[PDB]
Amino acid sequence: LDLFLDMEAATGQEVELCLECIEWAKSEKRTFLRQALEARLVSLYFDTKRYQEALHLGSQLLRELKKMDDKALLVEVQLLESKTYHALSNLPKARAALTSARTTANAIYCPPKLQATLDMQSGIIHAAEEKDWKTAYSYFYEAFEGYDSIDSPKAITSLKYMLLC
Amino acid sequence: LRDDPIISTHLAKLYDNLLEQNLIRVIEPFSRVQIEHISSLIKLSKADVERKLSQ
Amino acid sequence: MSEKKQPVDLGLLEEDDEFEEFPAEDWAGLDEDEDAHVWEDNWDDDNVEDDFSNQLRAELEKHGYKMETS
Amino acid sequence: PKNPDLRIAQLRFLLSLPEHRGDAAVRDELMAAVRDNNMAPYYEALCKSLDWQIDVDLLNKMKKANEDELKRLDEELEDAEKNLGESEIRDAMMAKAEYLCRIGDKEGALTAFRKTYDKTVALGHRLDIVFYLLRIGLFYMDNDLITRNTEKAKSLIEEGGDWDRRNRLKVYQGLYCVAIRDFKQAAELFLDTVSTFTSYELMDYKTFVTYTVYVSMIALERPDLREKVIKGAEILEVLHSLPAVRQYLFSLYECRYSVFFQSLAVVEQEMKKDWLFAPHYRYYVREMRIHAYSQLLESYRSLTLGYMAEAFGVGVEFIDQELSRFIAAGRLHCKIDKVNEIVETNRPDSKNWQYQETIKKGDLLLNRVQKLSRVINM
């Protein structure tokens, strides 16, 4: 699925075919599988800039994630929840989803793909209101510490964010 | 900068803030002055300058 | 005195006997849109309203045609 | 009532005045005729409707089920009667009364909501019955009758702001302040829009946004808009719903008349044909024009007619009679002259006029102490 979506080809059948993946995964009753398929499909609607059903279906996914286990999966959807309220420019719900992902991910050693994205988005939250660029520069600096030597577009946009803030 | 993120607004506020420092620099000694004497310093049109000033 | 109010009020009862509840109901056709709306505003709105009740009432639909012609 | 027959029965205004839009408006009314005992509303506005051929078919079926479910509420009321209970008789009387809102007759619903208004065990249930008069008072467009129970249910609440009860009443404050033309006290009412929601009892949330964009868009200034809404993220969420609204905020705030008048015809045609929003459509236009002309004319002392005609994208002949009507009629500023064919204001409205704003109250207090002199000795 991820290697099929990174090709960036024929995105019209991708979202419907992903709905056939959630349909098939529910047909064989694989709950965590279709939770992952919604977890990537909501990133597809984030890439499509369709903020209605991404926040709606993602929120209904939060209704079955707040009850269930796998707290690290909640960090993905509260992270991208912060991405979609920031993309809609809503600061308190982005700070609340951010802080909820922080107090969810405080016990879990996250991968630096997920661990650094908290502070990467957090610097855009604080320097979105431009409260303190010392703290925000700490967020893009530690974000650069997370994206160092793992991905070169992410690194050049990381130093773009350091020189930016 | 066409693939620039939402922070283009922050870059534009940096531009307009340096414009503000320009305006509070050159206008500040001047009670009454020509608009092209004072825009000839910055060699820019008076339209957007008039809009930002009057704004 | 206030007893000279009495023949003036006989004139008023002749005015109310001109039309019997024809103007209260028909002018209440305008009052039912106008009741509890502050009538100092209804003098301005009545002023420009009655000013444009003759011609060019809405007229903002026409200004887009006034662009190329003027 | 709180049924969707409120909003379908709210389409009768746009069904009424044009003959153009009365096709879909009669379409969902005829389709909605089988719903919520719709018989007596379209029988009432049937003069505003079609002929009597297919009309007399379904009236005979609705009229008998009317009395059937009515007498089941009556016998169910009697079985709720002669028995120990309050909320059983409250809800039997109340469902009877909402059924009387379904037929659309507040004769039996006035006395029925009056009886369960006397069976209110708490004031919260009383405010619920109050709102049950407000939702049909919206269709009925009474003024004092629906402000009476909110005036009396206003005092002595003492139970805190509830989640959509108190919010629902605050929305109703938005309702009658859409009805009335008081606006600067209507500017506080939509401030709960963080907490307002899709209310199918009265009004959709996006229609709540669509109606509060007018009172904000006209009735508020740039410190007011920059304070409340340009700062606020709530409009930053819902601006993505319609691209027009973002133009009517950003181009108006950006003071671009050549596009705002090009798009203002949609505010004009949208502004009419509306239930509670119709009769003031003359006022919002003119008030918005003078507020825009004061917006440009505030920061500008002298103004050529060339840059002005370029700014508005209109001929000079119209702005000629505009501001001439806005000296006396609009009453914006000091006298404008055409000896040089150039807009020139003076506006000495700060120094001495800041003191002479009080000579009006000095003369009004002077006549009021003449009234105090009229108290003397008799």
Side-chain angles (χ1 to χ4, degrees):
Chain A
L1 179 63
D2 288 332
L3 273 72
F4 179 72
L5 291 179
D6 291 331
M7 291 173 67
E8 291 291 329
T11 188
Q13 292 85 17
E14 288 177 353
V15 54
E16 185 267 330
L17 189 65
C18 282
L19 291 174
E20 290 184 355
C21 291
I22 301 168
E23 180 69 26
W24 176 69
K26 189 184 288 184
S27 178
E28 60 185 357
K29 293 183 289 295
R30 291 185 182 177
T31 302
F32 179 73
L33 174 58
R34 65 177 295 279
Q35 284 180 355
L37 293 162
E38 290 191 356
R40 182 65 178 172
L41 186 62
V42 70
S43 297
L44 183 60
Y45 287 110
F46 180 74
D47 293 329
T48 321
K49 295 189 289 185
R50 291 179 61 85
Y51 302 103
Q52 292 181 357
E53 69 271 15
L55 185 61
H56 183 74
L57 183 63
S59 297
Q60 290 182 353
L61 183 61
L62 285 168
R63 296 296 181 186
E64 65 181 1
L65 259 64
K66 292 178 177 65
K67 293 177 73 69
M68 292 296 172
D69 290 330
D70 192 2
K71 274 79 175 176
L73 186 65
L74 280 77
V75 185
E76 295 181 357
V77 293
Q78 287 178 354
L79 177 63
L80 183 56
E81 185 182 4
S82 177
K83 290 185 182 293
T84 187
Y85 283 114
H86 177 76
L88 294 173
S89 180
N90 195 359
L91 297 176
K93 294 183 182 179
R95 182 177 287 174
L98 176 68
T99 309
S100 298
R102 288 179 183 270
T103 189
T104 301
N106 54 6
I108 297 169
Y109 288 100
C110 293
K113 301 290 181 68
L114 295 176
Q115 184 67 41
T117 313
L118 297 174
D119 292 336
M120 182 182 76
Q121 189 65 41
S122 300
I124 313 168
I125 292 170
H126 291 284
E129 191 64 28
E130 296 179 353
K131 294 180 182 293
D132 193 1
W133 286 281
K134 293 181 291 295
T135 65
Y137 178 72
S138 176
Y139 285 121
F140 293 114
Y141 178 73
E142 293 290 328
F144 178 72
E145 293 288 328
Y147 289 103
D148 197 359
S149 296
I150 61 170
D151 196 3
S152 295
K154 293 182 183 179
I156 193 167
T157 195
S158 295
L159 57 87
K160 182 179 173 68
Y161 292 159
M162 290 180 69
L163 298 179
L164 181 68
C165 69
Chain B
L1 292 173
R2 186 174 173 84
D3 202 0
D4 191 79
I6 303 101
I7 47 94
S8 298
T9 306
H10 297 89
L11 301 176
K13 182 62 177 176
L14 192 146
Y15 173 75
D16 294 331
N17 196 2
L18 291 173
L19 176 58
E20 285 169 353
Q21 300 305 109
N22 188 9
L23 292 168
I24 71 173
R25 182 173 59 82
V26 298
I27 278 92
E28 193 270 337
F30 289 161
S31 65
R32 183 185 67 187
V33 78
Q34 294 83 15
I35 61 170
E36 65 184 2
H37 175 73
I38 200 164
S39 71
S40 67
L41 181 142
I42 204 58
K43 61 185 181 293
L44 292 174
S45 177
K46 279 83 70 176
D48 50 356
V49 173
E50 182 182 2
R51 292 176 66 249
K52 293 295 289 182
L53 279 170
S54 62
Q55 185 178 3
Chain C
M1 287 78 77
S2 297
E3 295 183 355
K4 298 180 183 181
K5 294 182 180 181
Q6 288 184 355
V8 179
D9 289 335
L10 291 174
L12 286 184
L13 291 176
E14 289 182 352
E15 292 180 0
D16 296 330
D17 284 327
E18 289 178 354
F19 287 157
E20 286 290 325
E21 296 291 323
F22 262 161
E25 291 177 353
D26 291 331
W27 287 101
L30 278 77
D31 292 331
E32 68 178 1
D33 289 330
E34 196 176 0
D35 195 2
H37 295 99
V38 176
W39 293 268
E40 191 270 331
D41 187 74
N42 291 313
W43 170 68
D44 286 328
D45 196 2
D46 201 356
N47 194 1
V48 176
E49 187 269 330
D50 198 3
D51 197 0
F52 291 165
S53 64
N54 192 3
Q55 286 295 110
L56 60 100
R57 183 181 62 80
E59 177 60 30
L60 270 69
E61 298 172 354
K62 190 180 177 181
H63 289 92
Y65 295 153
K66 290 171 68 177
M67 293 179 185
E68 67 273 14
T69 63
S70 297
Chain D
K2 69 182 179 292
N3 290 318
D5 195 76
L6 175 64
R7 294 190 299 273
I8 299 300
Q10 193 175 2
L11 302 175
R12 63 185 289 273
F13 186 79
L14 52 91
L15 188 150
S16 178
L17 279 76
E19 295 291 328
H20 303 286
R21 295 182 185 273
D23 52 358
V26 80
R27 182 67 184 86
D28 59 356
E29 187 69 28
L30 178 60
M31 183 175 69
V34 300
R35 294 176 180 87
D36 291 332
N37 196 1
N38 203 3
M39 180 172 177
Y42 71 90
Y43 188 75
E44 179 184 2
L46 191 60
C47 182
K48 268 68 184 300
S49 298
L50 278 73
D51 292 331
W52 294 349
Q53 294 294 322
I54 204 164
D55 186 75
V56 298
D57 297 330
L58 276 76
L59 296 176
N60 296 317
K61 186 175 73 69
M62 299 301 287
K63 73 178 182 65
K64 60 182 180 66
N66 192 4
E67 186 63 28
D68 287 332
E69 183 62 30
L70 196 148
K71 75 184 179 181
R72 289 183 67 250
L73 288 170
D74 293 330
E75 181 66 29
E76 183 65 29
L77 180 62
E78 292 171 353
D79 294 330
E81 197 178 1
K82 284 82 177 176
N83 290 318
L84 182 61
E86 296 293 326
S87 295
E88 183 185 0
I89 308 169
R90 181 183 183 278
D91 291 333
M93 189 68 72
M94 184 181 74
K96 180 178 182 292
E98 298 188 353
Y99 186 73
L100 288 165
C101 292
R102 290 175 183 88
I103 193 59
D105 291 328
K106 297 179 291 295
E107 295 86 4
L110 189 145
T111 182
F113 283 119
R114 187 181 66 189
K115 288 301 289 183
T116 191
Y117 178 77
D118 297 333
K119 294 190 292 296
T120 58
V121 58
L123 63 94
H125 292 171
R126 182 176 294 110
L127 187 59
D128 296 330
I129 299 301
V130 165
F131 178 69
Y132 294 159
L133 271 72
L134 302 181
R135 59 184 193 176
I136 193 165
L138 180 61
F139 170 72
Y140 184 71
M141 64 183 287
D142 52 352
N143 299 116
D144 199 1
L145 300 174
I146 53 169
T147 60
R148 179 62 59 198
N149 56 0
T150 62
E151 185 179 3
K152 190 175 291 294
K154 180 178 183 291
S155 66
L156 299 176
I157 294 171
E158 294 291 326
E159 64 186 3
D162 288 333
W163 190 249
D164 205 2
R165 178 186 64 88
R166 175 65 185 88
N167 191 4
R168 184 68 60 83
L169 183 62
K170 190 80 173 180
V171 170
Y172 171 76
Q173 299 174 1
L175 268 71
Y176 67 84
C177 286
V178 162
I180 204 169
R181 291 188 302 277
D182 174 73
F183 286 160
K184 293 182 288 294
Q185 294 301 108
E188 186 63 28
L189 302 178
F190 64 93
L191 194 63
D192 60 350
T193 187
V194 180
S195 65
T196 65
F197 190 69
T198 302
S199 177
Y200 65 94
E201 296 185 354
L202 291 176
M203 285 180 183
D204 193 3
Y205 175 76
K206 64 182 180 181
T207 64
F208 176 75
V209 176
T210 309
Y211 285 162
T212 190
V213 78
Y214 287 103
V215 59
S216 65
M217 188 178 67
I218 287 93
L220 275 75
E221 62 179 1
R222 298 182 70 190
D224 288 332
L225 293 173
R226 186 175 181 269
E227 179 67 28
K228 291 184 180 180
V229 292
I230 302 168
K231 184 188 288 184
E234 295 84 6
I235 198 69
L236 295 175
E237 294 178 353
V238 299
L239 58 83
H240 299 88
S241 179
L242 291 177
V245 178
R246 190 174 66 244
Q247 297 175 357
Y248 297 123
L249 297 175
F250 286 173
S251 66
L252 181 70
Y253 186 79
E254 196 174 1
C255 194
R256 288 183 180 268
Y257 300 103
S258 297
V259 62
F260 181 71
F261 292 161
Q262 179 66 40
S263 62
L264 190 57
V266 183
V267 188
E268 172 66 27
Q269 298 176 357
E270 186 182 4
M271 187 181 286
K272 61 183 179 180
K273 303 181 296 297
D274 197 357
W275 176 258
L276 193 61
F277 189 71
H280 319 295
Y281 80 104
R282 298 296 308 276
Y283 178 70
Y284 289 108
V285 171
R286 180 190 68 193
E287 180 66 31
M288 202 173 191
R289 299 295 286 272
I290 186 172
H291 189 71
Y293 299 158
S294 66
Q295 180 176 359
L296 180 142
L297 191 61
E298 176 67 27
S299 177
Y300 287 154
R301 175 184 58 246
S302 174
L303 279 161
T304 180
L305 292 173
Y307 176 76
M308 179 171 288
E310 289 291 326
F312 294 107
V314 74
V316 185
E317 69 275 10
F318 184 68
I319 61 174
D320 195 0
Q321 66 179 357
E322 281 177 355
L323 297 177
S324 181
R325 285 171 288 161
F326 292 120
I327 293 300
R331 188 176 178 266
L332 42 77
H333 289 90
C334 57
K335 182 62 187 294
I336 182 175
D337 195 0
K338 207 188 284 183
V339 292
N340 300 114
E341 299 174 357
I342 281 171
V343 172
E344 181 177 359
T345 191
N346 191 1
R347 193 256 184 190
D349 295 334
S350 298
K351 296 294 186 291
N352 197 2
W353 181 254
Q354 193 184 4
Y355 287 91
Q356 296 181 1
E357 285 168 351
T358 62
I359 196 166
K360 295 180 183 291
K361 302 293 183 182
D363 287 327
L364 196 146
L365 187 144
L366 189 144
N367 199 2
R368 193 173 293 277
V369 300
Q370 287 176 355
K371 170 63 172 64
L372 181 66
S373 180
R374 180 166 291 273
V375 185
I376 302 300
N377 292 319
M378 186 179 290

